[PDB]
Structure formats: C-alpha cells, structure tokens
Amino acid sequence: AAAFAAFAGFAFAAFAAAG
Amino acid sequence: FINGNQLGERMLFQVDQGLNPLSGGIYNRATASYTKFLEAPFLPKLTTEQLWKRKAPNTVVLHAKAGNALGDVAAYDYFSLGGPYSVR
Amino acid sequence: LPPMTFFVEQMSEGVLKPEGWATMETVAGLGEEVTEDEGAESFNHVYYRQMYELAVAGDPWAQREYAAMLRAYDKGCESYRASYEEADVDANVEYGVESYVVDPIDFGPSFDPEDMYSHRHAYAEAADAGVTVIPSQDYYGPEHDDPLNGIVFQYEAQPFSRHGWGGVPFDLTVCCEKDKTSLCLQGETHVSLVHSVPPFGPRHITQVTGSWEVLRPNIKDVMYQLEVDTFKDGLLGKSDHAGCGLMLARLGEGGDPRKGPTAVGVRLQDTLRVGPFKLEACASKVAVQKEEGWGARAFVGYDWLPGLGMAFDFIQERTRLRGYGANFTYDWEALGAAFGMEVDYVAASESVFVSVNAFSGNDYRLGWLLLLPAVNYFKET
Amino acid sequence: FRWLLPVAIAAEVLFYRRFLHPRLDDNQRRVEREEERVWALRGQQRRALGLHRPHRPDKDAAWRLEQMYD
Ligand SMILES: CCCCCCCCCCCC
Numbered sequence: 001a002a003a004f005a006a007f008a009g010f011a012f013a014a015f016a017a018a019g
Numbered sequence: 020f021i022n023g024n025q026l027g028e029r030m031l032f033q034v035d036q037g038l039n040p041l042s043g044g045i046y047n048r049a050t051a052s053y054t055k056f057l058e059a060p061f062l063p064k065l066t067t068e069q070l071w072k073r074k075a076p077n078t079v080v081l082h083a084k085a086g087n088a089l090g091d092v093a094a095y096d097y098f099s100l101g102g103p104y105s106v107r
Numbered sequence: 108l109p110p111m112t113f114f115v116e117q118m119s120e121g122v123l124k125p126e127g128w129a130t131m132e133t134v135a136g137l138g139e140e141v142t143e144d145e146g147a148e149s150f151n152h153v154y155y156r157q158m159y160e161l162a163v164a165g166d167p168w169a170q171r172e173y174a175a176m177l178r179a180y181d182k183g184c185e186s187y188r189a190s191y192e193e194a195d196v197d198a199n200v201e202y203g204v205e206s207y208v209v210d211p212i213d214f215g216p217s218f219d220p221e222d223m224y225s226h227r228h229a230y231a232e233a234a235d236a237g238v239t240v241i242p243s244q245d246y247y248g249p250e251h252d253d254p255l256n257g258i259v260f261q262y263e264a265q266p267f268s269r270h271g272w273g274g275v276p277f278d279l280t281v282c283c284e285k286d287k288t289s290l291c292l293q294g295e296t297h298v299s300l301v302h303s304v305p306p307f308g309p310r311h312i313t314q315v316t317g318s319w320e321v322l323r324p325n326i327k328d329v330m331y332q333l334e335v336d337t338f339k340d341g342l343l344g345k346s347d348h349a350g351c352g353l354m355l356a357r358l359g360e361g362g363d364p365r366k367g368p369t370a371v372g373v374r375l376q377d378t379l380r381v382g383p384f385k386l387e388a389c390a391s392k393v394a395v396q397k398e399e400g401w402g403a404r405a406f407v408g409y410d411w412l413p414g415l416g417m418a419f420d421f422i423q424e425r426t427r428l429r430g431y432g433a434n435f436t437y438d439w440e441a442l443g444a445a446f447g448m449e450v451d452y453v454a455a456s457e458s459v460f461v462s463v464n465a466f467s468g469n470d471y472r473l474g475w476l477l478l479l480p481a482v483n484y485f486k487e488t
Numbered sequence: 489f490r491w492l493l494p495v496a497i498a499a500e501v502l503f504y505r506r507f508l509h510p511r512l513d514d515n516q517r518r519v520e521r522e523e524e525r526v527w528a529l530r531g532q533q534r535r536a537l538g539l540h541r542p543h544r545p546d547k548d549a550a551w552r553l554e555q556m557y558d
Binding site for chain 2: 489490492493496497500504
C-alpha cells in the first residue's frame with residue numbers, strides 16, 4: 001500500500017503542477 | 020474611566036464567619052482593600068479637564084490591603100501572602 | 108516526537124478548501140448595493156489588475172475603466188472618513204469624557220463571591236487596533252486569585268493589494284504564557300496564493316502553513332511544522348476538488364534539525380459522484396525517522412436516504428494492525444420531541460456503541476416514559 | 489482564643505450597619521433624584537407643541553424593569 005500511495009501522490013502532484 | 024484612564028476610589032470588604040460548632044470550628048476572616056487613583060500632584064492639570072476636548076490625566080494609584088484571621092481556621096482557607104495579583 | 112498515528116490522523120482531516128480574497132463593498136458596486144457570490148469577486152480582482160496593466164499599455168477603454176474605479180474608491184474612502192468622524196463626535200456627545208467599559212468574563216459558579224474580581228476584568232474599550240486579544244484559561248488556577256493565565260493574539264491581513272484588489276491572504280496566531288518560572292509559546296501562520304480564476308483559467312490555489320511550539324522549562328525542545336497544499340478543481344471532471352499536500356515535521360533544538368527527528372507526510376484528497384453515491388475521500392501516508400503509517404477517511408451519502416450519514420475510517424500501522432471504523436447517524440422527530448441516534452462499529456475490538464440524544468420542549472412525557480432507574484436504585488444496606 | 493470571637497463580631501457590625509448601611513443608601517437615593525430630573529425634562533418636551541402625557545410607568549413596574557434591558 002505504501003508504493004501505491006507514494007505513486008498516486010507523485011502522479012497527482014505532477015498532474016497538478018503541469019496545469 | 021475618562022479618556023482611557025481611571026480615577027477615583029474603590030473599597031472592598033470581605034467577611035467570612037464560620038458558624039461551625041462540623042469540623043470547621045470557629046473562624047473569622049476579614050479582608051479590607053482600599054484603592055485610590057489620584058491625579059498626580061506634581062503633574063500639571065491636563066487639557067482634557069479644562070478644554071473638555073481628549074487627554075488622559077496622569078495617575079498615581081495607592082492600594083492598601085489588610086487581612087486578619089481569628090480563631091481556628093483550616094489550612095484550606097488559610098490567609099497567605101504572594102501571588103501575581105497580590106505582589107508582582 | 109508523537110507517534111505516526113497522530114500525524115496520520117492530522118493529515119487525514121478530509122476535503123479542504125483554502126481561503127480566498129476579500130473584497131470591498133463600496134468599490135465593487137461603484138456605489139451601488141451588491142450581494143455575495145464567489146467567482147464574481149476574484150474575477151473583479153484579476154480583471155481590475157489586467158485593466159490597470161492594459162491602461163498602462165495605452166488602451167483608452169482600460170484607462171476609462173480604471174479612472175471610474177479610482178473615482179468610486181476615492182468617494183468611498185471619503186465617505187468612510189466622514190462616517191468615522193461623525194461616530195467619534197456622537198461618542199463624545201453621549202459620554203462627555205467617560206470611555207466605554209467592557210463586560211468582564213463570566214467564569215461560573217463557585218463558593219467564592221461571584222461578584223469578586225469583576226473589577227479586574229472591566230477595562231476601557233480599546234481602539235480599532237488590527238490585532239485581536241483573547242485570554243487563556245488554565246485547568247487549575249490559584250485558589251485566591253483569578254484563573255486566567257496567558258494570552259493569545261490573532262491577526263489577519265491581505266497585504267500587497269492595490270486599491271483593494273489582489274493581495275496575499277495572511278493569518279497569524281501567537282499564544283504566549285510567560286511567568287517567573289515557565290514559558291509557553293505557540294505560533295502559527297498561514298499564507299494563501301492564487302494562480303488563476305475560472306474566467307482566466309482553472310481554480311489553482313496554494314496554501315502554506317507553518318506552526319512552531321516551544322515549552323521552555325518542561326520539554327526544553329522546540330517543534331517545527333511546515334505544510335504546503337495545492338488545490339485545483341475539475342482535474343478529472345467538471346468538478347472534483349482535487350488536492351495534494353506535503354508536510355514536514357522537525358523536532359530539532361533550534362533552526363535546522365541538526366540530527367533532530369524528522370517526519371515527512373503526503374496526503375491526497377478528492378470527491379467524486381458515481382451513480383447515486385457522492386463519495387469524499389482523503390488518504391495520507393506518513394513516514395517518521397523508519398516506520399510508516401497509513402490513514403484513510405471516506406464520507407458516503409445515498410440520495411434515496413438523505414437522513415442517514417455514513418463515515419468510514421481505515422488506519423494501518425507499520426508492517427500491520429488495520430483498524431476499521433464505521434459510523435452511522437440518523438435523526439427523527441418523536442411525539443413533541445426530537446431523537447438523534449449514532450451507531451459506531453469497530454472491528455478491531457469488535458465493539459458497537461449506540462447513543463440516542465433526546466430533546467423535548469412541550470411537556471415531560473419522556474420523563475414519565477423512563478422510570479426504570481428509580482426502581483433499579485436500591486439502598487443495599 | 490475563641491472567647492474573643494463574639495466581641496469582635498460586634499465591631500464588624502459597628503462598622504457596617506452604622507456606616508455602610510446609610511452611605512450606599514444615600515447614593516441610591518441620589519440616583520433616584522437624578523432619574524426624576526430626566527422625567528421632568530421629558531415633561532417639557534410634552535409641554536411644548538401640545539403633546540400628551542408620556543404615561544410613565546409606576547415604580548412597581550420600574551424595579552421589575554431593572555431586571556429587563558433597562
Ligand atoms: C509558478 C508556477 C506555477 C506552479 C507552481 C507549483 C508549486 C507547487 C508544486 C510542488 C508542491 C507539491
């Protein structure tokens with residue numbers, strides 16, 4: 001669950017920063 | 020309170036009598052506090068009094084507190100001395 | 108350093124929303140009555156900033172708009188100055204020299220004289236200062252003195268604003284308790300930043316919060332916390348209120364941790380509408396310096412049964428005891444009374460708690476309804 | 489010891505009921521006088537322009553109104 005949470009957080013941060 | 024500064028006199032009297040004759044016993048606690056906020060004699064009269072219009076007068080506060088206990092009083096209600104309010 | 112469960116509970120608060128801008132009422136309406144609606148105020152802010160830029164560029168229409176705004180702002184400022192002067196004159200007329208006094212704080216019932224120490228808390232009303240002062244009450248205080256120890260200051264501002272448009276929302280709160288022996292100093296600051304508005308793009312906001320705690324005699328150590336959160340709406344749909352946050356906690360002696368125990372946490376928040384279910388979810392993961400804790404909160408609603416409220420919580424310790432909790436709430440109106448029930452179920456301890464609150468204001472029918480404890484009460488010798 | 493407890497009590501009464509009781513009452517009476525003055529001025533307001541009486545309440549209503557916002 002740790003890897004999934006970290007990956008989801010990183011992806012969400014990258015998506016929010018891209019826009 | 021005039022112009023944010025307080026002047027006058029204030030008297031406070033507290034009497035606690037234990038009419039216990041049931042382990043309290045006979046006890047009599049009397050506290051008298053007198054506080055006087057007086058205009059400073061050295062300071063000249065301010066414009067807020069004469070012109071009536073915007074200055075707070077300089078003040079000298081004299082406070083006297085006297086507390087006396089008689090009879091047998093338990094340590095719970097015993098008079099003491101100190102604390103932030105009584106003595107800084 | 109507090110356990111990772113505390114940090115995971117702090118991070119999994121729920122769906123959040125940072126504070127926006129504040130707007131004047133006189134300038135926005137150009138001297139006319141207005142109502143309240145978000146989206147039309149940040150639009151006014153960004154629009155007036157852009158029109159100022161264009162007027163500087165040389166567009167005549169932007170110049171005309173900015174001139175009209177300046178005229179309205181000047182008229183409003185002069186009106187407020189006149190109102191302040193009139194209010195001061197009226198206050199002088201009512202009480203010639205006597206400044207207004209304030210009501211003392213009511214502590215409650217006690218065997219000491221209830222009217223005693225009231226004179227100490229009765230002070231003259233302060234001027235229109237920006238700061239706000241609140242007293243702090245300790246649990247146990249001196250027997251023969253007032254139980255109010257310490258103070259807390261609260262301040263809010265929107266600096267870097269021109270003519271009431273734009274700026275950076277900023278909040279500050281400092282609790283100070285200083286005596287001859289101890290010292291407690293707790294500070295917190297919040298800063299808001301806006302990147303775009305619905306007319307000029309999406310809603311992009313970033314909030315930065317920083318809180319530090321100092322307890323000098325007991326702990327002799329200070330604690331720092333810094334969190335940055337980013338919020339954007341409509342990331343995967345029309346509206347999803349997506350948010351992502353990162354927090355850093357340090358327990359160093361001063362400034363940098365200097366080998367002090369550090370902790371890093373990250374949280375994600377989103378709400379989604381699927382079929383008849385409007386689900387709000389917030390999940391966070393925290394890692395201290397090396398256990399890692401996970402937390403998740405969800406709020407679920409069913410439109411066919413709006414009276415029922417369902418909340419789910421899941422907390423996982425470091426690998427791995429998983430605690431699951433379900434809370435249901437319901438309300439109804441009885442005969443001349445209102446009853447509200449709450450059921451909490453925990454699977455870790457296999458426990459169910461049911462609470463029913465009742466309020467009746469017409470008569471004492473509910474009192475006659477319940478009389479079992481009177482018979483149940485026995486002297487037993 | 490305890491034998492001196494009652495006598496001092498008299499002194500306390502000698503300080504309060506001979507001195508405290510009149511003094512404060514005086515101020516109370518003083519306040520009452522001022523109150524009357526206000527109503528007199530109100531009468532003048534009703535005297536001018538031919539206005540009718542302001543139907544002031546009785547003291548029984550007044551002391552109850554002390555508990556009110558008044
Ligand atoms: C100035 C460019 C706009 C985007 C800035 C994003 C900064 C926050 C991203 C890192 C924190 C998650």
